[model samples]
Target: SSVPTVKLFIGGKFVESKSDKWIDIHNPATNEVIGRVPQATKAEMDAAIASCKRAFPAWADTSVLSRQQVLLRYQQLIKENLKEIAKLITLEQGKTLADAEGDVFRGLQVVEHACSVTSLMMGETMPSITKDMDLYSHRLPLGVCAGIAPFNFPAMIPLWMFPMAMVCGNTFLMKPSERVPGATMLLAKLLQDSGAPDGTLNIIHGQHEAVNFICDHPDIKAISFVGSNKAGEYIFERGSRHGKRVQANMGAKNHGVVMPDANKENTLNQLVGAAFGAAGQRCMALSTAVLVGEAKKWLPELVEHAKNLRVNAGDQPGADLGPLITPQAKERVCNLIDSGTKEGASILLDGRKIKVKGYENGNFVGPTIISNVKPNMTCYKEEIFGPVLVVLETETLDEAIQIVNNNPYGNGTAIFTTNGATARKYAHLVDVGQVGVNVPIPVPLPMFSFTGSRSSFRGDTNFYGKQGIQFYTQLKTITSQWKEE
Candidate 1:
């Protein structure tokens, strides 16, 4: 069947948004105009919500084993089409093909984790919590739910939220990043092909108007959102106020610590990939490098090497990193690099103007390194959301730990060290959510929830791992009496 001009998928039909107009889509890498996706108005948003509700009964009635089977099949299909999906991800989102494939693989792993949900989501029973009474607990599906995924890791992140929820028996309404909407619609089709019933899964594309519509809708039972901290807070607050269960994962100023006894050689090499990978647009990216004073002798070497790190478009096999998602993103990253220079920090690498071959008009920001960073500077205090890395020196291990612990955002943090005591101390004292001991990007595995502290995250329920099952489902309790014959 021919795909209808990339319309909104609801009730298994690719219908135009009520506006019947289109939003211009662009290839972030080449600045070329791609196709358009319909910008849905309130009416279309309501229609999709209505469709989700309509699909709820049949979906809820499905057994856990059946849901697991469908998710497993979808997982198999994703594996078969992984490269094709990865290419679509790169075309729209501008990630390297390798990174795109990595995203799909990460999301693929999460879905695979969900395939065994029959074991994970099993009800629990206790012999007795009170006299002559047994205690038992089980989860029930949230009738209808939604996920709002961000653009940086469009495919993987949505896969984290939706598949886990769907396998737990919640029908979904997904709002993928507007910057990379194509892959998600393709995922919706894949779901149906995997035997998902009509209306069991839907994908909608829009901007603020669409977001507002989803938040205001009454039938939405739960929502899981991944984006900026400001947007995450807004969604968490508003969605909860609207009586929907919500999990909002926002931005991070994820830090990587270098202790006095740390492995300078390995740590420096790890930083090369951790900070610039995905152009440092990742929320879990290592934006801040905290160093104990005794580690300062090796710091200059690390800074110098960072200055020479290669940056490029993903055309070649060996490019260090690619462009940011849009021209505005490039500008924001460049300005922050400038801000670091003007604020008395040593400019080790100026990625502001480095260009790549074959992608002259690309939205690229080369990798950057800043040294002698002050805590008050914007680059130090905020999530850079770019390939810009800052180095701050602290007098003691306690001070380095304090710096990470005191940061307002706490999504991810790491320490590269050989000292078990120091490593254990950092782990026990740090307030960040995901920790890496001698590791760089410390994103948790699929079996464990990925979360953060302070403004980095919100809501009681986090996404992925077991929390996903609980977030997408509700609980019910029943009592009965029986007479002995």
Candidate 2:
């Protein structure tokens, strides 16, 4: 069978994009073009926005229970197709089956939360301020909304935006990352089968061109974006300028601190997975490690464990970490490693030239560890979105705090400590939006929104939770007075 050509979901049908320009979607594990995604034309983008705009009134007027019912059914379909979705993600995005499942399930959690939109969208009421007077506020869906996703989590990021947006009665258009469009297209079909109205959910595919159209399009009332710092900032600025609500999640260089009193085995295990898992391509990935005082002694064992990880094709059984997203990703990772060595850091475990036996053409960069990494080093400063972990040593936890706090990003940070007060202190004082005591990845569950501080992110409200509900809808306060005889 011929490889699938990714289609645009417009109105109710999956339509071929009217675009001559197409991007080859690769299986990072095999370097084979698994699919083709079109750079949708301006007319196609406009048509999607128009469809969503047309769908808005009917969807918004739908009763909250009806909306919730749709999400409830959508959730059932999601669980039924969980494995199939994960496999598609592994095929195009090159994430291990387990990691891909984690991505889908996390996104599924958000959908589960969205299923309660009837209560989640509740507003407030105040009765009889004066005689025969009442005041109430209720949430109403924004007319049309748009989402732009990055390449990292094909299933998770878009799931964070659209389910909540749609469940809240807003029509949505998704621009899944061009790097991996197949999983999102599958999700579109599932959403279509859930009996949601036509034009309620549309999806387009392209790079910056389509993104610019989304930002400039006046019909889109709110915009959600997850990508690099430059793109997030651009979307926030442009979308906000156009009088649209925008939540833009940007880059992250999350860090982990190891204290002397921390359990050696537990801390090392969590840190290894956090740093090297998914080939370190996560926005919340732990890119740097701060070893405080005597805890620095655990460094050698940590490197040994990371070295033992079985990096291979995403579909290969028991693969711990899979290939990077593209050949250019591998090259960039190697360049960073080379720069680190040039700047006086030691390459403790270099896997830049890693070549998998059966998949030699894969973009496989094995788990990498850079020691004696300084703040001034390029590898330390940049978001090395690869299977690379850079180490920095400090004399005290306070020093470690200062090191993390001063960084340009504050998306997430964690501390490994047995001492109770010590963990609290780090949690309280660390500037990042998410903190973990013993937990490595501190990503919040569905009830809490994903947040980031400093330049790591910029937005009005965060994604997936109360904030997500709020972002997709507007508060309409009604003051009522009745005159009766």
Candidate 3:
């Protein structure tokens, strides 16, 4: 059966966009018109924002324990709908179903963390410093906040922003990537069916205009955005200018360093998976591999393993990867690989001409590996969000460390080495937000905050774990009643 004509999800209701115009949501696997979501208008956006404003008080006024119950029920519902949700993410975003499921699981982990909010979400208490002036501080919501998620991890990224935002007792207006709008609606429905209050949560979809409005809206007390570094900057600058707290996770040019004495067997697998998984759409995607001296010898073995990256659809079991979200994405990444080639990098594998059986019309870009990249090349300097991985050579471990640190983005970095002391030193000295020792793509556990540095992330508070607890809430001090003595 065909999916319903996807519609705008607003405050516990499914509504038409104020505009009658629509765009077809494509199944990247077949280039099929899966469904169309209304291209929301300014009027519809106002309605959605107004709905969130109305629902904030009731959702916020609920006791923390009650809010915890909502999270628990929502978590249960997500658990029940995990498979269906994963399918939607795969269909809309063109990631492998396994990766899609992992994304769903990652988001669900936050919901699970939210279920324990009674203790963590509560504000810390401080005893009175002055005599008889006993005081404690309890947390409060920021009323209606906004979460703007990108197309990469449609399910997981939104979970990162909204679940904690909602559990913190804040009403939310989520602006999901128009590239994949189904997941937000599905997730919103699941939450409402599990007892989330109406108007406490809503979704609006558009390109540029909607995002600008969300950032500027006076009632939105905070803005959480996950996207390109450039876009993150705009959200942070504009949102903060409007007097809103903002947490914007931006971009990365992450590196995975292979030391001379590293174990090639494990490191190869890790790099191949981490570098190209989900078509390299992750902000923390390791796009570069730094080889230290003798480690360059393992490049051939690594290339051999990376050669197996199969381009297939999300539904195809045993496929190594899936299509890019759109044709334009494929073109952009292909152009990056072309630049890498023209810039003198050796193409160990080229993905541009690869084809998938039965899904020839899909936006599939196979895994590509480029060696001999240097800091001077655009491929080496820019964040190439695709299946292309660039390898750069460093003479020593220190050089690798220095090269990784000097880069503008500090989103994620990893090292492959046998020396414990060297690993420890690299972990401590590296400037990146998340580090992996002998592991690639070091995304922190769902319970710990995920952060980026330099231009990679725009604000202080990161949205996950306890940091998330702080991100979605405000605290107030309380004093006990006392008789005049």
Candidate 4:
């Protein structure tokens, strides 16, 4: 049997893309091409977009409970096939089986939330604003919405974008990262099988050219993007300029503050997972550790914990993490390590030379630590999206909070402390969007929208929750005075 090829899901069916150019999808653990995805030409994308537009009127006019019922079945299918979908995620994305399950389960939470769309989509009303006058506001679906998700999150990110939008009666077009298409297509197929109408959800695969095409396309009414800040800004600017509402969740260099009073063993274990899990490829990965006061002494133990983290092929039992997405990703991470060393940052634990047996060609980078990191250093300035923890020391919590606030990305930051007073102060004073007092990553559940601040996000509304429902729909207010003729 030969390696499989991906088919674009459009008009409620899987169709062969008309484009001639195709990019190979590699298994990061094996460095082998597992599948190929077609880069859609203008004609192909136009048809998909047009198909979504064609499907919009009937879908939007459909009863809310009907939409809710469709999602109920969709989530049921997801529950039944979650393991298989997670397998697809790991095979293409190179995350461990547990981490892959995390992705699928977290994504499924949003779908479950969407199944309760009846009350979530309810409108607001105020009677008697004036004499015999009443005003009410109802959120109605936008015609066509598009989601452009990154490769790092095969299921969670795309699921974050589409479920709420579709449940609100909007048609969606997804442009999943060309690097990981198999897992995404499987999820889309599940929705189709769940009785969603034709063109309820469509997908196209491509690089930056397709990004630009989606940005400029007149039919796409709203866009939700998750990726690097550079690409996020590019899409936000171009897509908004084209009169489309765009929300962009960008890159981050999330930080974790370790205080001396924290539970040492628990903090160390959690910090290791936050920093190095998924090979430190998460946008919310705790990549920086701001050691406060005497807590700096724990660096050696943290290093030891990071060192013992199991790294192997994703399919191997007990593998804590797999390889980076590709060899180029490995090179980029390794190059950043070199840059950090050259810039005079002391290497506490260098994972640059890590090797995994039997998968020598796999792109593996073990847990790395750089101590005495300065704000201006390249490693601190740029998002080193690997298992590298940049350590910064501060005499006081105020200055430590300042360091996190001053960073360009305000995606996620955490403080580990036992004192309620100090935790409250840090939570209040810290400027990051997500903050965890005893936790490492502060990503909220599906009930709350993902809110990243400063340079880490664009657009007013965040993803999922009430804001996500708002982002996918517009409020229609009615003010009327009824009179007896």
Candidate 5:
């Protein structure tokens, strides 16, 4: 059976692209063409931008309570359709159903936060500056903000950008990844049904042509992006150069340090999920494991554990890991694994031979573990972005810190130990933007900012949280004196 084609969503309605060209979307679990998304011509992109522009003034002037009501209803609708939404994500994105549910749940947290926009959008007023004078400052929404999301996290990343932008009284234009465009378009429909005015939220699907149009469009006052380092850098440079505010969250080579005092069993258990969950396709994934002192003794145990992980199709229940997004993605992971061996890293558990019986043609890559990985190796230096974990040995804590600090990415890192002082020191000394003392993945809640530093991120403000609110708004201060009549 052929799935319905996903269409461009503009002005609170779904429509076809002007170019009439389409791109195929696949179901990674079965390698079947599930649906098609429009190639979105510049004319279509222009309409999306213009729709937001036309809707901005009314949206900005909308009472905070009115906006809050819309977000509250939208969040309710998301919760009501939670299972359906997760299934859509799994069908298009090829993650386990449980993992897909988590993605939608996390995105819903931001919407839950946005529900309090009545309080979140309050301004500050000073009683008086001098004599009878008064001063106040307000956070004004930027008009027609845009988001360019990656395929890795179709629902959560778009939720990270749009809900906050809309809650802050800004109209939004979203260009979700062409690879997984349906989920976001479905979300747009719910937003409209929740009382979002026409053009208050719009989504257009395309490749580079749509992206270039979004970045180069003059009316798009701000842009938020999440993707690979090269693409993130390009968006940041081009958008900023064009005088638009941009937040481009880039690549990562996150490392997890195993200390001598750490609990061997607990560390291994958590590390398994951090390194291989979602098949190592996460930006915050622990791609490198730095073993300090006695921690190196656990390598053999780690290998046995890694070799036993259950690899199957995403739709199959109880599967620990799933296939990569596409055959090209599988090939890239294999080539990098080969390069690691050529670069002198020992292959402890090579996943290149993995094959699922029922889904032979699916893009499956097994859990791979490489030992004695050096800093100079391409597998260690670049983001492998697959279910391959590279092990690095270090004699002391300082050595571990030095290795992590020298890496170009500072997105996330972690330290595992029961020692309070050691954990505190490692957290303080590590150069990464987000650090975890004992937690495997250090992603923050909606109240705190999701931030990265160094080459991992480009832009002064991070996305989602107060920073999200700040990113979509400009500050305005006014002072006035009224003479007595």
Candidate 6:
């Protein structure tokens, strides 16, 4: 079986790494070796950074209409190839085809938003200030910027970054997750073909050393990242130390609270989808279910629905859930399930021993439900990035809110309730960054910024929309005065 080598896209062309080292990329659903991505050396990363540095000034000076035109064309090209791109995503990333297409669509939304960058980049003016003096402020694009994306969203997350960064006039260097680098390589070509100037957008594929190189590079003015908590914090601290602007979106232990007054069937269905979608690899996935007072009665129905979810390889039609990213991920998820049992959480629908029909070697874990989860249990406290849902019982809405607020990570949270007062109060009182009133996942639209508080996010400026524009550029204010005529 022949597998193409996925090389680095630097200086507007695909080039093999100087080191010749490579990492094996796999199809998680079948545990088959699909291809190899470059394990780029420090010198290789430096070259990509240098290319962006050289391209920045010309790109920054490019007319806004020209930039918009390029981005619009790029967006359409992506739409045309959306199916091909989605297949690659499912092949390597292990998310179902529908979810993979959703990934491309979400990223496409960001591209659509970037086409209107002219409006977002507008300047503000004050007609008069103190004796015929006038002042105005405008945004200036920063120099070369870089992004490090996670494997869960090879397309959408990287799309969230480079389009906004480049459209704002900052040349970009993107390091897609080594596990799923092919889609990004394909996208880089589309970007170049759609009128991106040479070296304006570069995609490098590697691991820790590559990340350090980007963070430490003096020429890269900013870095945006989405990954685990430890890595996010590390990039924020190290990049900031190097005088580079950083936005590091970290992990989440999102909670979905169900009040007694909630619609039981609707809440149960949303919970099943939210907790099990993408195999629970999403940052906004509802990992915990807080049942307020008598709402605990719905647990049996929740367990029944979860048990019926169709688990198989992502490419299979009607597959509701897919395998974990790797066998190691499968092992880690199983270990957590064991720990949950040891800590006295009652396993409702255990997925530990389940196996797919034909894909026996695939890294699959069925939807798991563990009830009687206490605040002190390891499973309750940690962000188990799997399709394992934990249930906690609270006496009141305040208790449920307290439980959610007490969690260290505050990326996103949701409440299912029919009472208007309860919904309003929860919306106001919850400390998490995004909240949902009867909605499960509170991920904002492309027009609104994807932001988080506490340990979930490291930087002040979030990603996408106005905050993205702000992060990728700097503000400059000028005042003019005319001598008395």
Predicted structure 4, TM vs. truth: 0.96
lDDT of 4 at 3: 65
For candidate 3, lDDT tens digit of each residue in 97-210?
888788888788877876787778756755665666667887788788888889887888888788887878888888888878888888988988998778888888887888
lDDT of 6 by residue, 1-485 (tens): 54778878878888877646667777888888888876887777777878888888889889888989999999999999999999989998999999999999989988998788777788899967778989989899888888999998989988899998878988888989989888898788788889888989888877788888888878888899988999999999899999988998898888899988876887898898888888997765787889887778778899999988878889997578888888888888898889989999988899867788899888888899988888878887788889899888777778788888888887888889899899899978889778878888788789878768768777868888888888887999999897689
lDDT of 5 by residue, 22-100 (tens): 6777778777888877788777777777888898999999987888888888898988888887988877888889998
Better of 1 and 3 by TM-score: 3
Where is model 6 more than 4 Å wrong at Cα? Answer: 127-134, 481-485
Candidate order, lDDT descending: 4, 6, 2, 5, 3, 1
In the predicted model 1, the residue pairs found to clash are none
| lDDT on C-alpha atoms for all candidate structures | 0.79, 0.85, 0.81, 0.86, 0.84, 0.85
lDDT of 1 at 8: 84
> Between prediction 1 and prediction 2, which has the larger lDDT?
2
lDDT of 6 at 344: 91
Q: What is candidate 1's lDDT per residue for 1-485, written digit by digit as tens? A: 32234678878677766655666666676776676776777777777888888888888888889888999889999999998898888788887888988889988988988898777677777654555566667788877788898888778888988887788888889998776788988787778789877888877888776677778787888888888988888887788888888887788777888877765887887886778887887866887788786666666677666656676656557557788888888888878887878888886777777787777788877778777787777788667888887888777878888878788887788898888888888889898767788888677788878766768878778887877776776776644333354
Of 2 and 3, the candidate ranking higher by TM-score: 2
Error of 4 at 10 (Å): 2.1
Candidate RMSDs in order: 2.6, 1.5, 2.1, 1.7, 1.5, 1.7
Candidate 4 C-alpha lDDT tens digits along 381-434:
888878788888778888889998899887888899999888899989888777
The lowest-lDDT stretch of 10 consecutive residues in candidate 1 is 476-485
Deviation of model 5 at 10, angstroms? 1.7
Off by over 4 Å in 5: 1-3
* Deviation (Å) of 163 in candidate 2: 0.6
| Regions of candidate 4 where Cα sits further than 4 Å from its true position | 125-136, 481-485
RMSD of 2: 1.5
Candidates 4 and 5, the one with greater TM-score: 5
